[PDB]
Amino acid sequence: GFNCYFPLQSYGFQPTNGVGYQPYRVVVLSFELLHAPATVCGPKKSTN
Amino acid sequence: KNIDGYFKIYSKHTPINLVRDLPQGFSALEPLVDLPIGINITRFQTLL
């Protein structure tokens, strides 16, 4: 109604909408640290 | 066992010809699984 609105609104994402309105895919990496054994680490640089 | 938040599994498949009880002798058990589960364990159950 007049005071009732749908909580979800849709993007336009037109091909010519221009930078700032064009779709952008975002991947957010969050590093979780706890008092548990470490499982994820950077590569070990193997040399001869 | 669970030490330092690390779950360890050891095994040994020596052939046993005494069906009554475990024969007298010595056999060390090699490690197989070293997964850091991180889930505290206080109970145990077996599948059949």
Ramachandran quadrant class, B38 (left: phi over 0; alpha: psi -120 to 50; beta: rest): left
According to DSSP, the residues that pair with B10 across neighbouring strands are B31
Identify whether the C-beta of residue A35 lies closer than 8 Å to the C-beta of residue B38: no
Q: Which residues of B touch A40 (CB under 8 A)?
A: none
- Provide the H-helix boundaries in chain B: none
> What is the rounded CA–CA span in Å between residue B33 and residue B18?
28
* Residues A39, B35 contacting (CB under 8 angstroms): no
- Resolution of the coordinates, Å: 3.2
Written as six digits, the tokens of A2 are: 């007049």
Question: How many residues would you count in chain A?
Answer: 48
Residues counted in chain B: 48
Residue recorded with tokens 């007298």: B24
Residues B2, B41: contact at Cβ < 8 Å?
yes
Q: What is the CA radius of gyration of chain B?
A: 14
| B36 Cβ contact partners less than 8 Å away, ≥ 6 residues apart | A36, A37, A38, A39, B5, B6, B7
Query: Which residue in A has a C-alpha nearest to residue B6's C-alpha?
Result: A37
Q: How was this structure determined?
A: cryo-EM
The residue type at A20: G
**What is each CA distance from A4 to A1, A9, A20, in whole angstroms?**
5, 13, 29
Rounded to the nearest angstrom, the minimum Cα separation between A42 and chain B is 18
